[PDB]
Amino acid sequence: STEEATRWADSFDVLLSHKYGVAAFRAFLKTEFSEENLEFWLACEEFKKTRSTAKLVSKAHRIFEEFVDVQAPREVNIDFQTREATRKNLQEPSLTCFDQAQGKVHSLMEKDSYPRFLRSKMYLDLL
Ligand SMILES: [Cl-]
Numbered sequence: 001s002t003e004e005a006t007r008w009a010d011s012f013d014v015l016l017s018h019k020y021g022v023a024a025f026r027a028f029l030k031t032e033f034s035e036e037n038l039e040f041w042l043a044c045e046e047f048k049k050t051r052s053t054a055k056l057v058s059k060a061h062r063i064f065e066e067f068v069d070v071q072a073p074r075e076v077n078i079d080f081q082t083r084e085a086t087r088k089n090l091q092e093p094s095l096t097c098f099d100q101a102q103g104k105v106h107s108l109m110e111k112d113s114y115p116r117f118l119r120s121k122m123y124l125d126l127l
Contacts, residue, residue: 001126002126002127004018004020004021005123005126005127006127008021008024008118008123009118012106012109012110012114015114022038022042024117024122024123024126025038025113025114025117026038027122028113028116028117028120028122028123029109029113031122032113032116034113036067036074036075036076037076037105037108037109037113038109039067039074040063040066040067040068040074040076040101040102040105041102041105041106041109043063043066043067044063044098044101044102047059047060047063047095047097047098048095050095056093056094056095057093060090060093060097060098061090061093063098064086064087064090064097067101068083068086068087068098068101069083069087076101076104076105077108078101078104078105078108079104082100082101082104083101085100085101086098086100086101
């Protein structure tokens, strides 16, 4: 458990592979008002498990509308070109629809929030 918390510092992707790692990071992001980045990333991970093509289409539109589109309530601050590439992808949705956008939010978290998380009292109190 102390060992596991230490493991989260191996890399951002290692943190993300642990349910308690995700929960802890989620809580931290709420304190910096950026948890939408992780919510979007996790939604994309769930999206990639979709088998049904009808569900794929409806779920792609919901995720796009929530996080990516103009006026998204949980808009992620990815670059405008990636947003428009994503909008084009959504004209014929597939399992790769969000790859570029997910990649950008992953990078934002790995480079900005994750290093800050590892210096937080929230994390350090777990040893
Ligand atoms: Cl990714």
